[PDB]
A paper describes a structure:
BCL-2 is the founding member of the pro-survival class of proteins that includes BCL-XL, BCL-W, A1/BFL-1 and MCL-1. They exert their pro-survival function by binding and restraining related members of a family of pro-apoptotic proteins—the sensors of cellular stress (the BH3-only proteins) and the effectors of apoptosis (BAX and BAK). Four or more hydrophobic amino acids on successive helical turns within the BH3 motif engage complementary pockets (P1 through P4) in this surface groove of pro-survival proteins. Venetoclax competes with pro-apoptotic BH3 motifs for BCL-2 binding, releasing pro-apoptotic proteins and allowing apoptosis in cells primed for death.
Additionally, we obtained a structure of BCL-2 G101A bound to venetoclax, representing a milder introduction of bulk at the G101 position than the valine substitution. The BCL-2 G101A:venetoclax and BCL-2 WT:venetoclax crystals were isomorphous and there were no significant deviations in venetoclax positioning or E152. Furthermore, the E152 conformation in a BCL-2 G101A:venetoclax structure matched the WT conformation, not the G101V. The G101A mutant bound to venetoclax with a KI of 110 pM comparable to WT but distinct from G101V. Additionally, introduction of an alanine at the G101 position did not provide sufficient bulk to displace E152 in the crystal structure and affinity for venetoclax was maintained for the G101A mutant.
Residue numbers in the entry: 9 to 35, 90 to 203
The structure:
């Protein structure tokens, strides 16, 4: 599977669903559909967390990378599982929405890059060794 495509299709779905434009996301698919529905379910179960995160990020172009790294380290500090990976995608979405809300749309390209590099380097071994995206689809698809 393709981590860049998974990130691109997720961020495009989340932003387009809420009326936000991301030019670079303008457009195997059972993975995208499964992640979409898992993420939407996560968002519904933890709306209060979705709301507190959006209201406190306080992004600027120079602090965006540090805010992303700080949250993602805390998310995986106790270990990785599929639910924390889904939460990682939803947090990336929140970062992208808040970037546009604060007139920093170019930051969406950076956030998508950071998310991809994170799957490619930090989370890669865990995802592969726990069955890859195919296991994720079999468990939650
Ligand atoms: C600084 C911070 C670190 C502070 C903390 C927080 C917020 N926290 C993050 C961690 N969190 C977690 C973590 C793990 C799990 C879990 O059970 N893990 S699990 O057992 O592996 C699994 C279990 C079920 C499914 N799927 C169900 C299917 C049912 C049928 O429909 C399809 C889906 C999956 N799965 O992967 O799909 C995997 C979980 O519970 C659930 C429950 N329901 C879920 N539905 C989808 C995912 C999911 C997880 C919730 C709780 C909220 C921060 C925060 C804030 C805002 C944003 Cl925006 C983000 C983060 C920041």
């Amino acid at each position: 599977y393709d981590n860049r495509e998974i990130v691109m299709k997720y961020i495009h779905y989340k932003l387009s669903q809420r009326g936000y434009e991301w030019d670079a996301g303008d457009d195997s698919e059972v993975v995208h559909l499964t992640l979409r529905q898992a993420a939407d379910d996560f968002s519904r179960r933890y709306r209060r967390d979705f709301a507190e995160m959006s209201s406190q990020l306080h992004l600027t172009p120079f602090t965006a990378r540090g805010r992303f790294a700080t949250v993602v380290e805390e998310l995986f500090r106790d270990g990785v599982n599929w639910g924390r990976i889904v939460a990682f995608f939803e947090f990336g979405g929140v970062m992208c929405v808040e970037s546009v809300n604060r007139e920093m749309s170019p930051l969406v390209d950076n956030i998508a890059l950071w998310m991809t590099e994170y799957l490619n380097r930090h989370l890669h071994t865990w995802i592969q060794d726990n069955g890859g995206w195919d296991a994720f689809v079999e468990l939650y698809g």
